[PDB]
Coordinates of C-alpha atoms and ligand atoms in Angstrom, one line a residue:
Chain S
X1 CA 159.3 126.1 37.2
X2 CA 159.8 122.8 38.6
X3 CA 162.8 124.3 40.9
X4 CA 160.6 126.9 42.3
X5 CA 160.0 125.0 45.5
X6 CA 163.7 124.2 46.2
X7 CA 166.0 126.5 48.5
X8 CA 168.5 128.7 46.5
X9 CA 171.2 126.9 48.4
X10 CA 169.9 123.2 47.9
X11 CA 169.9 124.0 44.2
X12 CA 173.4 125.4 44.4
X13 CA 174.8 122.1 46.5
X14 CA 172.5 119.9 44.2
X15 CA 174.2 121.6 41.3
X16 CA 177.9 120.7 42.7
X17 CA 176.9 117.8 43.1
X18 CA 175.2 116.9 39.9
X19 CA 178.8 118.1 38.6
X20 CA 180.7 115.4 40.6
X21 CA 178.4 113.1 39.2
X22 CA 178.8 114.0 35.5
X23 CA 174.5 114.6 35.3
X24 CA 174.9 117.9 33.5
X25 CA 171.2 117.9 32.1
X26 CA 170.3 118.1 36.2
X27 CA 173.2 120.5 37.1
X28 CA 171.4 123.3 34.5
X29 CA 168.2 123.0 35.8
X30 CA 169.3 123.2 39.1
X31 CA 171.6 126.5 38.1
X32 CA 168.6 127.6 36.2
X33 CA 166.1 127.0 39.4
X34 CA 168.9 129.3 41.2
X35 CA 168.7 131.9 38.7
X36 CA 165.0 131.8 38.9
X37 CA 165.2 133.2 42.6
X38 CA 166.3 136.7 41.2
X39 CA 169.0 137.3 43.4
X40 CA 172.6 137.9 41.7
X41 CA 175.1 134.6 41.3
X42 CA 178.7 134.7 43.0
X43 CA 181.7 134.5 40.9
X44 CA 181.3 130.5 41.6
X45 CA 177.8 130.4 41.2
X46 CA 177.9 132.1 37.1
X47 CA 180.8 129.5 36.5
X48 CA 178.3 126.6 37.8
X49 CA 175.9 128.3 35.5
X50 CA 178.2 128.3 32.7
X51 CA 179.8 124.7 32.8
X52 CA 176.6 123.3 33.4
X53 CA 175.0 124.8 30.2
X54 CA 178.4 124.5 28.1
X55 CA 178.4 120.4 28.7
X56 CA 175.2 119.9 27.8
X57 CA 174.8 122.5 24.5
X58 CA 178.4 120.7 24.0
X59 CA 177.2 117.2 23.6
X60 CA 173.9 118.5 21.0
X61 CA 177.3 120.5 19.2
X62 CA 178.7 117.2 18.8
X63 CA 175.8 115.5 18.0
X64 CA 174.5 117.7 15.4
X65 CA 177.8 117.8 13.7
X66 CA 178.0 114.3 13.5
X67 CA 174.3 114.3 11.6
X68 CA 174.7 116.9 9.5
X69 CA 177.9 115.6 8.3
X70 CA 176.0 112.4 7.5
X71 CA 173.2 114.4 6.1
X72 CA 175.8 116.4 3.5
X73 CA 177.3 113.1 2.3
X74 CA 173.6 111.7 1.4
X75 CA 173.5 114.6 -0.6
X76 CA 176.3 114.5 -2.5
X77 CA 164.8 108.9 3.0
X78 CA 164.3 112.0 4.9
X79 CA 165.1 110.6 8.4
X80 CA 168.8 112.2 8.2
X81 CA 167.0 115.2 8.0
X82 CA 164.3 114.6 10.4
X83 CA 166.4 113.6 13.1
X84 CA 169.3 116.3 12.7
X85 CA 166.4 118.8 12.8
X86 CA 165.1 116.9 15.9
X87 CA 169.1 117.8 18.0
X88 CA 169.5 120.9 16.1
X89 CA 166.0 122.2 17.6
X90 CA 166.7 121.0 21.0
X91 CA 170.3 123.0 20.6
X92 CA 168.4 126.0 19.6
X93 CA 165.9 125.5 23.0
X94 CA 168.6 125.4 25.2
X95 CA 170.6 128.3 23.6
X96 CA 167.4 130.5 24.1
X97 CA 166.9 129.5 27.5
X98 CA 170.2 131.0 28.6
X99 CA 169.7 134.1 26.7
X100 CA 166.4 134.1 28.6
X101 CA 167.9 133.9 31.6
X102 CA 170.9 136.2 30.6
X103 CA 168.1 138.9 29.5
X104 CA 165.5 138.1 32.4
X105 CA 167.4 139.6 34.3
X106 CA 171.4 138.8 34.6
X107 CA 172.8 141.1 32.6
X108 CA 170.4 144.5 33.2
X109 CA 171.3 143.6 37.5
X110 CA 175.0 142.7 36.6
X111 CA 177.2 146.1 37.6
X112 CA 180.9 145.3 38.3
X113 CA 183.1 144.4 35.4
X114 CA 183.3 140.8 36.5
X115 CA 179.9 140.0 36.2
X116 CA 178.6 142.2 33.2
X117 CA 181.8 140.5 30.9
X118 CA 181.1 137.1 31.8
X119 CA 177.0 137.9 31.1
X120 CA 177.6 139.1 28.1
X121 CA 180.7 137.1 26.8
X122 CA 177.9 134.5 27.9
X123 CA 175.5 136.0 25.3
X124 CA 177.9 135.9 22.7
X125 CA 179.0 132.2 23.2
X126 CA 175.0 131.1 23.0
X127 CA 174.5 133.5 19.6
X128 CA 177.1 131.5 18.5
X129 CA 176.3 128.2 18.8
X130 CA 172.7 129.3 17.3
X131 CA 175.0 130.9 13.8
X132 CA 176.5 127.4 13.8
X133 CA 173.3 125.9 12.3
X134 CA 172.1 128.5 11.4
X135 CA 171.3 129.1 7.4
X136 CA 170.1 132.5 5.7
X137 CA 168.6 135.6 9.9
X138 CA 171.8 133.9 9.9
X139 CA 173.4 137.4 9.1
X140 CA 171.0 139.0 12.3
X141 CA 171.9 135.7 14.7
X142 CA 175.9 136.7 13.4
X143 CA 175.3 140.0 14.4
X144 CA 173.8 139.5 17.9
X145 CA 176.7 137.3 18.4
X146 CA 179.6 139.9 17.5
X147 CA 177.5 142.9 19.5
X148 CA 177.8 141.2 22.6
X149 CA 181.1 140.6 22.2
X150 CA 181.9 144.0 21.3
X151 CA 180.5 145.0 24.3
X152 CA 181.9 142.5 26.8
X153 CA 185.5 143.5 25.0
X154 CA 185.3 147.2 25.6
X155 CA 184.5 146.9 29.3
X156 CA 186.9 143.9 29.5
X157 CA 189.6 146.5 28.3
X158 CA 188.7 149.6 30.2
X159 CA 188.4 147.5 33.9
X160 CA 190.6 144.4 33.5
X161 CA 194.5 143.6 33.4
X162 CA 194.6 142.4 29.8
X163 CA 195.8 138.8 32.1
X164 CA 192.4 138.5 33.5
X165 CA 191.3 135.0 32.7
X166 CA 187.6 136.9 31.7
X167 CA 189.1 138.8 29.6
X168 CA 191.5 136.5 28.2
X169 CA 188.6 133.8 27.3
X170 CA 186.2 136.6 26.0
X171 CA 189.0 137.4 23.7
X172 CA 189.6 133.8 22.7
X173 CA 185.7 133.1 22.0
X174 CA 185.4 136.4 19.8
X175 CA 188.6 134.9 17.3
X176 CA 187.2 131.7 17.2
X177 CA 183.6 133.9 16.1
X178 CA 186.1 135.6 14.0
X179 CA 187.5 132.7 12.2
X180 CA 184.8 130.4 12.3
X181 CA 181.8 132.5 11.9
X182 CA 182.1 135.8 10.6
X183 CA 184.6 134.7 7.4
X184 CA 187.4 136.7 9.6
X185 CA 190.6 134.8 9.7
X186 CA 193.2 137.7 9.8
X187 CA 190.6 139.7 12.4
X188 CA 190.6 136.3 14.4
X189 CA 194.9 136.0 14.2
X190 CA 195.0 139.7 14.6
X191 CA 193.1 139.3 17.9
X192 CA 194.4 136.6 19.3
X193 CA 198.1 137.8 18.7
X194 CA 197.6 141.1 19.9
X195 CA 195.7 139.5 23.2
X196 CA 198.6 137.3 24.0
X197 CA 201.3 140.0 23.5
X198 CA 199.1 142.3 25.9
X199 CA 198.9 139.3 28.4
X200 CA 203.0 138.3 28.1
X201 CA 203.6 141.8 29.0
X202 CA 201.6 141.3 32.3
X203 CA 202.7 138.2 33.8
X204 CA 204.8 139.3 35.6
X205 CA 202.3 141.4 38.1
X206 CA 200.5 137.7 38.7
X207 CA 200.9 135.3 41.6
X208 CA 202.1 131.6 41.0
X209 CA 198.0 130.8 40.8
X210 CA 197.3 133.5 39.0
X211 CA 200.3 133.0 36.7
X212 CA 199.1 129.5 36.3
X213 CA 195.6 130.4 35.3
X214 CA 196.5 133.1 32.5
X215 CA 199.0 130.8 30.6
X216 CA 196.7 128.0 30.4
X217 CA 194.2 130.0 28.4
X218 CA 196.8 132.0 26.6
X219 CA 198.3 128.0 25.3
X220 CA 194.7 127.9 23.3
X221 CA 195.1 131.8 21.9
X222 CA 198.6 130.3 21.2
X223 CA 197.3 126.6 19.5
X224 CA 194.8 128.8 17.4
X225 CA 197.3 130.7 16.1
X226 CA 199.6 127.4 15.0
X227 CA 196.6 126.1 13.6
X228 CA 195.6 129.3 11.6
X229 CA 198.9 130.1 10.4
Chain F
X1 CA 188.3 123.0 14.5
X2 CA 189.4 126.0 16.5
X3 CA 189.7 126.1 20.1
X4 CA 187.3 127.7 22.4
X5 CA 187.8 128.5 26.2
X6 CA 187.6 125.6 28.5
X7 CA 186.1 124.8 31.9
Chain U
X1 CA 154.1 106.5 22.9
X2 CA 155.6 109.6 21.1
X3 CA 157.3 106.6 18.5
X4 CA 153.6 105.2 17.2
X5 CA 153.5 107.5 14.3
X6 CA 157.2 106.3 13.4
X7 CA 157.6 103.6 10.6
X8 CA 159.4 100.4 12.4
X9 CA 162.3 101.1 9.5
X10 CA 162.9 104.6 10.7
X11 CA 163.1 104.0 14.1
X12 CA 166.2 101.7 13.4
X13 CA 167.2 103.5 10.8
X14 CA 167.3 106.8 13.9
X15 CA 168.7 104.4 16.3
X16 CA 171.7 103.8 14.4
X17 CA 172.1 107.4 13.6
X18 CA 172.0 108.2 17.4
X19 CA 174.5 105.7 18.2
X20 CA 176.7 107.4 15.6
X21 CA 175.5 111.0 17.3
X22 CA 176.3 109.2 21.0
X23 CA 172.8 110.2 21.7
X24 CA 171.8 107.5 23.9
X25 CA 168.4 108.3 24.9
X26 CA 167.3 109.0 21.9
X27 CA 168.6 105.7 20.9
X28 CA 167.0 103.7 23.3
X29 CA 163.2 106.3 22.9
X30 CA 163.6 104.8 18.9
X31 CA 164.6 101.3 19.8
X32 CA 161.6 101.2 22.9
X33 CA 159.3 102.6 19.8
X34 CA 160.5 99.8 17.4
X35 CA 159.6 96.7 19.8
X36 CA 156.6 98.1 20.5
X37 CA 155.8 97.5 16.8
X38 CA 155.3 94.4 18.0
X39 CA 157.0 92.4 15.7
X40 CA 160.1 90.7 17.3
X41 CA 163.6 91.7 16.3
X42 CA 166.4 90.4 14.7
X43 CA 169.8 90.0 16.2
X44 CA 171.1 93.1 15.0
X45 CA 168.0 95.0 16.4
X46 CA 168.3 93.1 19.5
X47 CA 171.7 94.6 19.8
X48 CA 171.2 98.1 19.0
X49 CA 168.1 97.6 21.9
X50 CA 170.8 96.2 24.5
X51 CA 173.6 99.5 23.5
X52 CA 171.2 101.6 23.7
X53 CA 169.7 100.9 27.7
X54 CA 173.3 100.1 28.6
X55 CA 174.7 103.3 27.7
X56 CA 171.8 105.2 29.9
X57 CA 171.5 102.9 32.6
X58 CA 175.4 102.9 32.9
X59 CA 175.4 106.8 32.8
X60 CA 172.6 106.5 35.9
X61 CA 174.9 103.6 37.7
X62 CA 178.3 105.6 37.5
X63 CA 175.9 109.0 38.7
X64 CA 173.9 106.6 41.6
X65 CA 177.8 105.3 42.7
X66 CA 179.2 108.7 42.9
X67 CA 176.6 110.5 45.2
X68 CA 176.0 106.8 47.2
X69 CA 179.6 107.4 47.8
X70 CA 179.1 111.3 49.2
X71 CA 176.1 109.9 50.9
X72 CA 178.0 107.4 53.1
X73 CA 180.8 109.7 54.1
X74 CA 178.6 112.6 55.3
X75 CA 177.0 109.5 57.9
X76 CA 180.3 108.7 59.4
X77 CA 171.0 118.8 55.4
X78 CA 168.6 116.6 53.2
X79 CA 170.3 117.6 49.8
X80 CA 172.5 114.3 49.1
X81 CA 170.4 112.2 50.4
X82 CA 167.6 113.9 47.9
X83 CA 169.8 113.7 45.0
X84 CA 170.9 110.7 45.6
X85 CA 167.0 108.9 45.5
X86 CA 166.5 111.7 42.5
X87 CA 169.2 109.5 40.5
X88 CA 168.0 105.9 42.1
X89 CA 164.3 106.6 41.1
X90 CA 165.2 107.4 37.7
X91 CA 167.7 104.6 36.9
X92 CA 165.0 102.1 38.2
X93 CA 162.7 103.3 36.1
X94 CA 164.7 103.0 33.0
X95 CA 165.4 99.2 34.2
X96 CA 161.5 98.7 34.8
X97 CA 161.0 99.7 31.3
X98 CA 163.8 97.7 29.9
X99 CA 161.8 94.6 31.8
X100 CA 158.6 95.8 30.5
X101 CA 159.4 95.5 27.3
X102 CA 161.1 92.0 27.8
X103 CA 157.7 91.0 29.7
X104 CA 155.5 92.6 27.0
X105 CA 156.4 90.8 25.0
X106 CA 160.0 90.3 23.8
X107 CA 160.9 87.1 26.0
X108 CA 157.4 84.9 25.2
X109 CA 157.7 85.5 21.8
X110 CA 161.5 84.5 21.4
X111 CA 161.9 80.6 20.6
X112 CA 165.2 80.3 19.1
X113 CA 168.0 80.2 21.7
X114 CA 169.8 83.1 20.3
X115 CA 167.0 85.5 20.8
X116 CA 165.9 83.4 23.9
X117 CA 169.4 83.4 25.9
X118 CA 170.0 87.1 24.8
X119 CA 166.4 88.4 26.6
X120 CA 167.0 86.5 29.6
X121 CA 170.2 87.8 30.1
X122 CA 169.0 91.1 30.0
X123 CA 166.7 90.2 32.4
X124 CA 168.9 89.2 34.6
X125 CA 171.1 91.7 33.9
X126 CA 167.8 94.5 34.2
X127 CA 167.2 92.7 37.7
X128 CA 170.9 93.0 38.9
X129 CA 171.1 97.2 38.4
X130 CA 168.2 96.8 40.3
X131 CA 169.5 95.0 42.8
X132 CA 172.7 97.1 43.1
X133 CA 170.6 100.0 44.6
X134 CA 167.9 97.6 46.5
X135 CA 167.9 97.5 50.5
X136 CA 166.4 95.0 52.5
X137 CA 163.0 93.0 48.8
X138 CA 166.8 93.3 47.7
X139 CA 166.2 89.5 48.3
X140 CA 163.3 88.8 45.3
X141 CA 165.5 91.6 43.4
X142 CA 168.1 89.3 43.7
X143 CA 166.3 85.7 43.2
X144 CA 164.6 87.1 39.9
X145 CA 168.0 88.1 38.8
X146 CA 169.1 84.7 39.1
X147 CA 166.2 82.9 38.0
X148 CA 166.5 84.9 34.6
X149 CA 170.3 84.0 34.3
X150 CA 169.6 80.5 35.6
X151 CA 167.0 79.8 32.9
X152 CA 169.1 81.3 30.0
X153 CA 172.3 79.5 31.3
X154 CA 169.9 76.3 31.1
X155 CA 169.1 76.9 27.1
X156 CA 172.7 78.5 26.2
X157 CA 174.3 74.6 27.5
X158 CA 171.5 72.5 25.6
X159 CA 171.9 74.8 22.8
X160 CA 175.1 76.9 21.9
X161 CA 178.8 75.9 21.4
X162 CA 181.0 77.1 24.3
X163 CA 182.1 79.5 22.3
X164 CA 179.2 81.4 21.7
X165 CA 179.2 84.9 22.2
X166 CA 175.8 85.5 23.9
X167 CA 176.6 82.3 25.8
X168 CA 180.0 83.6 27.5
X169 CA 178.3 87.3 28.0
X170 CA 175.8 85.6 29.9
X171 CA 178.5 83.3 31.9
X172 CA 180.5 86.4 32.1
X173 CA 177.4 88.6 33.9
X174 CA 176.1 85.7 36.0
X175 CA 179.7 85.5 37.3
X176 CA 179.7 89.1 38.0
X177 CA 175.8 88.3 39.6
X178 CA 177.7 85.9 41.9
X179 CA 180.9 87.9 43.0
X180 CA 179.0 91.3 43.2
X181 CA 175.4 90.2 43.9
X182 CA 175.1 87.3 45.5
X183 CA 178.0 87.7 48.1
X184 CA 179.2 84.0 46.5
X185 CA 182.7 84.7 44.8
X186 CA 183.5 80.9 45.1
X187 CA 180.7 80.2 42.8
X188 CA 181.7 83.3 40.6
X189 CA 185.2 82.1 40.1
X190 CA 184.2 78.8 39.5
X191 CA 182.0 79.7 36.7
X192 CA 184.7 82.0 35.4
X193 CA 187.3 78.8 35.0
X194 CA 184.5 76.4 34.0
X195 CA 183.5 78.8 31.2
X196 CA 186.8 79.9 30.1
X197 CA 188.5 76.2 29.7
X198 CA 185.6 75.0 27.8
X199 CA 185.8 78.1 25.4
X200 CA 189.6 77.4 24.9
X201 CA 188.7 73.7 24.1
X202 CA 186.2 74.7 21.5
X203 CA 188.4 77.8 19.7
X204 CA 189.6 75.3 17.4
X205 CA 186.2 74.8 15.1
X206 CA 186.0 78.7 14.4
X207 CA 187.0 80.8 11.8
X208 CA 189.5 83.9 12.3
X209 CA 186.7 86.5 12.8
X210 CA 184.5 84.2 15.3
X211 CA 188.0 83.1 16.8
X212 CA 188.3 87.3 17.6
X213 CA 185.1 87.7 19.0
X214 CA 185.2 84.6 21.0
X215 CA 188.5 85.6 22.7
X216 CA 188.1 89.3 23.4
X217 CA 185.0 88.1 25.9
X218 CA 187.1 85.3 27.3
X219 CA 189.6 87.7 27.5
X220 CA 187.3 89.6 30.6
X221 CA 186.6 86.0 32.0
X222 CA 190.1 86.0 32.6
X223 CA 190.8 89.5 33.9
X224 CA 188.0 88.9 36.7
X225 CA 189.8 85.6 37.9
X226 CA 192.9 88.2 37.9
X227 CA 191.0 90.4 40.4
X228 CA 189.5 87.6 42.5
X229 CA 192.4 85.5 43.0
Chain N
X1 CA 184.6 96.6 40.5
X2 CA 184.5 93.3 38.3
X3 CA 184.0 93.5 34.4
X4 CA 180.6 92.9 32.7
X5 CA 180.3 92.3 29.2
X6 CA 180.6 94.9 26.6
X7 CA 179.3 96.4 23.6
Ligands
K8W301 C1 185.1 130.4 45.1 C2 185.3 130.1 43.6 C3 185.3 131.2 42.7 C4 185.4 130.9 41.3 C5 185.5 129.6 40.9 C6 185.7 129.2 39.5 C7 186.3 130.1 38.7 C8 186.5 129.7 37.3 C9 185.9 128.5 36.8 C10 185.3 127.7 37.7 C11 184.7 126.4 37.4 C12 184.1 125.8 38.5 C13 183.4 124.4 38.6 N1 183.5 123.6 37.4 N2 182.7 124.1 39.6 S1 184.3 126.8 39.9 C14 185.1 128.0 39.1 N3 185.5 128.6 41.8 C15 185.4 128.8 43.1 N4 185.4 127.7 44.0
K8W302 C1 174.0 92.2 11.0 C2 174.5 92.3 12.5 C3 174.3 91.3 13.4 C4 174.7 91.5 14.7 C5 175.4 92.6 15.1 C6 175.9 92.8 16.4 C7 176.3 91.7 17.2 C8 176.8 91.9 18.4 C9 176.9 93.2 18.9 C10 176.5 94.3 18.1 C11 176.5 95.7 18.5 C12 176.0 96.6 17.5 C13 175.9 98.1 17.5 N1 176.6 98.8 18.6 N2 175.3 98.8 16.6 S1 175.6 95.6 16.1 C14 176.0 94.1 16.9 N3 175.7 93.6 14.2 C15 175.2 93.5 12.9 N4 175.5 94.5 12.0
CA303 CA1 196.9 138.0 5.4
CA304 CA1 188.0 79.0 48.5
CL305 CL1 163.4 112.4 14.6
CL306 CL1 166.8 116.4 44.0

């Protein structure tokens, strides 16, 4: 691609810095580019890869739920429908770029637990987003979605401290799939209750920074739950 | 809307 | 371009649907499209054309001031420097095309002061980005900037109320030309009290809704002065 | 930074 020319570490520094700047479209072609160089990422280079990726599928997210809220209402010219296609395709192109890049070749080279639950918590997330517009395929999307998540949970349980902010997030992502996608509320409650009892019941092992980095994501399983019961 | 894990 | 199959009425009818989306290219793609119809545009269309090239060049200005910023620190590898003229070359091609259009043939077509005043402000205003980023040639960035807002500010005093809302945008911008630009904050604080007194002797011909508009323009008038004196 | 005029 059009990265192929640029260092692995200029892409990485360009990505940071694309970051600082707020240019998120450049800071996932530059993390894309660094995938592209078939070497493994660092624990700071997949989070680059993720934030990058999560701003800008974020903003289409937005986006498209702001047209097809518009469209739904019309329906209760077809340039609604023309131009929510128009976001909702461009959602689906970058969602199948990062499963490209998670299958070609992350998660097959991914071995330690910390790598292979991000990749594939990672997977899940961008199925996701696709069953979010998606409509009737749907059901094999859906099910993409919850198998990677399976996957990334059993490992997660087997070779991390159930305070691991991995773990803790994969477990957070796969109630909201509950709730929101799969028609699951009392699997998604279930799940997050039982993930922030396991997680309460380990804080004490943790560090002050440590400590500080598993409550904060444990306040959203907690928020969740206020908000689905 | 439920929450998802942040940055 | 891409737009030429596009009906004039869908393009406006996407640009306002991006807005509401905060999809800001797209807006400005649809409202580039609709002037190249070639007919001219009315003062709402001339409005959706300015949002739409201020949200993206404003996203490229706050990006250009972040890694200018990195750029000067590390001078007191190649990679910020790089990024840096990545950014520059982009917003200052959005701003060509912004003057393009006005060239081609927005301003020569636009007789009435309203639509007059309005295009050579934002051909001044098109000039000053440019100018922001301009080294040394940063002079005839500069002394087409301020032919455009001369020439405007000429037509808005012949031809509009003090009041006017195009007219104290402009008065506002050519101020910010003087203080920021121009290296001439005298003159910029002069124009700011010279404008703002003569809009607080007019506020008493308008109705509550103009009055409101008027004053919340007036309003940054005033906060400048705050700043420069 | 001085204040332009907004939207
Ligand atoms: C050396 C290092 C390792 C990991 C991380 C990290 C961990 C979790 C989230 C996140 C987001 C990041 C970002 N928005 N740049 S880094 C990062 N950071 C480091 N510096
Ligand atoms: C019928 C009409 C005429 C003028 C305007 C207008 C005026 C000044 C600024 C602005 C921004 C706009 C936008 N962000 N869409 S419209 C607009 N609006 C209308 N509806
Ligand atoms: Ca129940
Ligand atoms: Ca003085
Ligand atoms: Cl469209
Ligand atoms: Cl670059």
């Amino acid at each position: 691609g059009a990265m192929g020319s640029m260092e692995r570490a200029s892409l990485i520094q360009k990505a940071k810095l694309a970051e600082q700047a707020e240019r998120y479209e450049d800071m996932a072609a530059f993390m894309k580019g660094a995938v592209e160089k078939g070497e493994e990422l660092s624990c700071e280079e997949r989070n680059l890869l993720s934030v990058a990726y999560k701003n800008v599928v974020g903003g289409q997210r937005a986006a498209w739920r702001v047209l097809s809220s518009i469209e739904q209402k019309s329906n209760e010219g077809p340039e609604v429908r023309e131009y929510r296609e128009k976001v909702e395709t461009e959602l689906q192109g970058v969602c199948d770029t990062v499963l490209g890049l998670l299958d070609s070749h992350l998660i097959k080279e991914a071995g330690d637990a910390e790598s292979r639950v991000f990749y594939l918590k990672m997977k899940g997330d961008y199925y996701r987003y696709l069953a979010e517009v998606a409509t009737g395929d749907k059901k094999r999307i859906i099910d993409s979605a919850r198998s990677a998540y399976q996957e990334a949970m059993d490992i997660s349980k087997k070779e991390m401290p159930p305070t691991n902010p991995i773990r803790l997030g994969l477990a957070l992502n796969f109630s909201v799939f509950h709730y929101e996608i799969a028609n699951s509320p009392e699997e998604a409650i279930s799940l997050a209750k039982t993930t922030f009892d396991e997680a309460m019941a380990d804080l004490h092992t943790l560090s002050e920074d440590s400590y500080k980095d598993s409550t904060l994501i444990m306040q959203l399983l907690r928020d969740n739950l206020t908000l689905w019961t | 809307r439920s929450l998802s894990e942040r940055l």
